[PDB]
């Protein structure tokens, strides 16, 4: 009974992560921050077609997936930092072609690989580097001319929700894999829950809402 019930969850990891992969590959959605979000899409789709099914070379991929997620979660907090502390535009200095090479390197290193090497370290820095970001993003957020927006006639409040949607996607992966790295099968089941949150929070938070609704023929809010 409960087994067949968990079969619907699988489709969520083969559909919720597909509508994302094909989304990035619209012109407006093609960005570096979204180029690592699609990296986590593959790490989630592979764990949904290779790990979830058989679990409900097989363990080799189970590691490659998870040890690449929390690894890229670190890549994000460091990339977005080089964009806020940046002088020019709210935009990382990582080029499109240099984003692909650091994406390919995330997999190889994640493959040659431990809860301190592939969990602690990448989460330790990922939390502090991002903590530095959310703090600076507040100092700058309201260093803005107060007159701006009420007497009209660059980092702003809109770009401040881009770190909210990224702050929760990074804040959920931790509470879903922390008790696990800290019944043992149930907490290893809580880990698989982060597979249905990515396409969920990417609705009522970012632009993806409009992306997802397009990929599905003018769903409802048209």
């Amino acid at each position, epitope marked *: 009974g409960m087994g067949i019930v968990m079969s619907l969850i699988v489709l969520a990891i083969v559909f919720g992560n597909v509508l994302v992969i094909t989304a990035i590959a619209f012109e407006r959605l093609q960005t570096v921050t979204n180029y690592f979000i699609t990296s986590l899409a593959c790490a989630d789709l592979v764990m949904g077609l290779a790990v979830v099914p058989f679990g409900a070379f097989w363990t080799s991929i189970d590691v490659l997936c998870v040890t690449a997620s929390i690894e890229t979660l670190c890549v994000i907090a460091v990339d977005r930092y080089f964009a806020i502390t940046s002088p020019f535009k709210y935009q990382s200095l990582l080029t499109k072609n240099k984003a692909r090479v650091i994406i390919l390197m995330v997999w190889i290193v994640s493959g040659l690989t431990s809860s301190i090497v592939s969990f602690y370290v990448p989460l330790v820095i990922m939390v502090f580097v991002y903590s530095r970001v959310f703090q600076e993003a507040k100092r700058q957020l309201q260093k803005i001319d107060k007159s701006e927006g009420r007497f009209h006639v660059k980092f702003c*409040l809109k770009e401040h929700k881009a770190l909210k949607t990224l702050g929760i996607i990074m804040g959920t992966f931790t509470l879903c894999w922390l008790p696990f790295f800290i019944v043992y099968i149930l907490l290893n089941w809580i880990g698989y829950v982060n597979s249905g949150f990515n396409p969920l929070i990417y609705c009522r938070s970012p632009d993806f809402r409009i992306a997802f609704q397009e990929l599905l023929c003018l769903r409802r809010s048209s």
Partner: antibody
């Protein structure tokens, strides 16, 4: 042709609730905060809250904290104010400003049996 | 919160003469002050924001000049149409606090 339209008159019994709307049209809705200000009969103004349509950041006045709840509609380009458990002292003119720059028409709410 | 007095309270001036109204806040707003005008039976029209920056469409005879804690709206050469209640407003920090509002009439 910049303007924020409002009801002008709203009647509601005590203990009830009203939802005042403000239909802006003459600029880009998601470029300006919209503020809701209360001005009682022949008295000054008191800021209720300030919702920013673009993002969603809503900042209330402690006084109206659990009283009013602002809400915007990026599509309809209209913003509402949810006012709950109304009381006799809630009767006044409720303004919808485009951030203290362009004041709305004004809705004359009156709580009465 | 942040009290903001606004002297005078009442004021009778005659056409042509310059009326001046002052507005002081308790805290130190960063010139984030605004001046607006309520006329009996109308909606408040804004004259000035950011301490000195006239709003577009407002007569150049309105002059806001203040800094830090004390500001003041001046109108050189008072016009007949310039009769009503003028309020000041600070938007430096929450909650936004309005002034009492000085009322200006014209001696006939």
């Amino acid at each position: 042709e910049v303007q924020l339209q409002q009801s002008g008159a709203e009647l509601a019994r005590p203990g009830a609730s009203v939802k005042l709307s403000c239909k802006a049209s003459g600029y880009i809705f998601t470029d300006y905060y919209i503020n809701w200000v209360r001005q009682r009969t022949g008295q000054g103004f008191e800021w209720i809250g300030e919702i920013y349509p673009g993002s969603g950041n809503i900042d209330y006045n402690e006084r109206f904290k659990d009283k009013a709840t602002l809400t915007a509609d990026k599509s309809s380009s209209t913003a509402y104010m949810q006012l709950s458990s109304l009381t006799s002292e809630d009767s006044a003119v409720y303004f919808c400003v485009r951030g203290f720059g362009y004041w709305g028409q004004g809705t004359t709410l009156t709580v009465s049996s | 919160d942040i009290k903001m007095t606004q002297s005078p309270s009442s004021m009778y001036a005659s056409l042509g003469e310059r009326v001046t109204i002052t507005c002081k806040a308790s805290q130190d707003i960063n010139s984030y002050l605004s001046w607006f005008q309520q006329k009996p039976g109308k909606s408040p029209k804004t004259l000035i924001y950011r301490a000195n920056r006239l709003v577009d469409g407002v007569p150049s005879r309105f002059i806001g000049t203040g800094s830090g804690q004390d500001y003041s709206l001046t109108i050189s050469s008072l016009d007949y149409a310039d009769m009503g209640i003028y309020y000041c407003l600070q938007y430096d920090e929450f909650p936004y606090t309005f002034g009492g509002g000085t009322k200006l009439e014209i001696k006939r």
